[PDB]
Design a protein around this ligand. Sequence first.
Ligand SMILES: Cc1cc2nc3c(=O)[nH]c(=O)nc-3n(C[C@H](O)[C@H](O)[C@H](O)COP(=O)(O)O)c2cc1C
Ligand SMILES: Cc1cc2nc3c(=O)[nH]c(=O)nc-3n(C[C@H](O)[C@H](O)[C@H](O)COP(=O)(O)O)c2cc1C
Lengths: 200, 201
Amino acid sequence: SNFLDLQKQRRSIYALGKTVDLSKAELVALIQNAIKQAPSAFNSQTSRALVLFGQDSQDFWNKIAYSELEKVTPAEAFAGTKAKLESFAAGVGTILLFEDQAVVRNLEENFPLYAENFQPWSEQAHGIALYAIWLALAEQNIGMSVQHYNPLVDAQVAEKYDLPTNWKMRAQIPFGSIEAPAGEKEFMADQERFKVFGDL
Amino acid sequence: SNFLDLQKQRRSIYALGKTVDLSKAELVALIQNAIKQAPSAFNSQTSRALVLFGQDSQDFWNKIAYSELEKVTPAEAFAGTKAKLESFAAGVGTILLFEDQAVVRNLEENFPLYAENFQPWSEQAHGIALYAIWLALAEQNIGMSVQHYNPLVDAQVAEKYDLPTNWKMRAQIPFGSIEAPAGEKEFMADQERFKVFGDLE
Ligand SMILES: Cc1cc2nc3c(=O)[nH]c(=O)nc-3n(C[C@H](O)[C@H](O)[C@H](O)COP(=O)(O)O)c2cc1C
Ligand SMILES: Cc1cc2nc3c(=O)[nH]c(=O)nc-3n(C[C@H](O)[C@H](O)[C@H](O)COP(=O)(O)O)c2cc1C
């Protein structure tokens, strides 16, 4: 098999469970290594990550995200939110990805000739880290989805885990065993997406 | 041979050659399929790409890039620029990655509540398409690098190929045969980069 097979295997999984065959040490090393190997502009390595397990992971969703969402969600709609938060907490853990703003700013100040690009290149590096993790877990038959309850949960997350303010949260990832396969995904016409020129 | 092996094999190759044993059709498929499988915010699919071979690929660096860099690069320094441009054209081809702005705008306009997320999600989607290609090619022992001469060469590239005006260029990737391994790698202190809380049930 090749990389294309793994790419096809990787999908967004919303039905997660706790039946994984890897330990904490193996899960931690898998995640961190996947992120460490993900490239970044000038090897700035602005990628930061928080990995939660057990009660911690579940509390992030059922307590942190929960308390914040009820302050902005309609009463007649909260029931559906609580259930959704539970589905994410039903997994093995949660990964929170951050981008170190102190490193991006240091770059802007020292190399203004590039400045404008540091912010976008930082967002690009985050995406790369996200895909790196997604691929690494998919190969191990571990499912996950990408969530964006930021910056709503930012405040509480930082205080609870003594996270520097410069660590700007960009995504929260619940992961676990795959309890239900994803459905049919759609693709756009390749003709209006790509263009080839030249021969070689 | 897990994913981590491939990740570690993927490096920024600056020494490229023209000795690739894959037909154009296979190269095109490799690149396009890798992009298609790369995810994007609610399957928005804002990634676009232009693959150039031969003269087209060579001209992008020696003509378009060159001409634009020359008009803004110091005389007593342009010498190095030309040398680099030729190292990129010494490969098999070039990949230009764009992000469809028309799609992103339609989202920011209809979703004034999430408007601020689309731009960063687009940049992130671009990075994902980039890494997807970089990995697909590394597995084929095909080297490449990511360059950023945008938006300096935006107008000429868009004109020469008459691309949709919404295709905002984000990167130019020269690929070819790996003529020499990458240097050494540097990693920051992990205890400064990560944090772990909790245990498995
Ligand atoms: C968003 C982003 C922008 C990048 N831009 C450039 C660039 O303009 N020129 C270049 O030579 N390398 C560029 N790179 C490559 C990185 O500098 C390189 O991946 C990093 O130093 C690590 O090296 P490795 O790829 O060999 O592991 C970029 C990487 C990312 C993720
Ligand atoms: C930058 C970026 C942001 C995303 N954000 C969300 C999100 O907020 N919520 C969600 O459920 N999925 C989110 N996704 C996942 C995509 O919707 C999903 O990957 C896409 O529809 C393709 O499906 P697949 O992941 O199953 O291949 C995001 C993906 C990217 C690349």
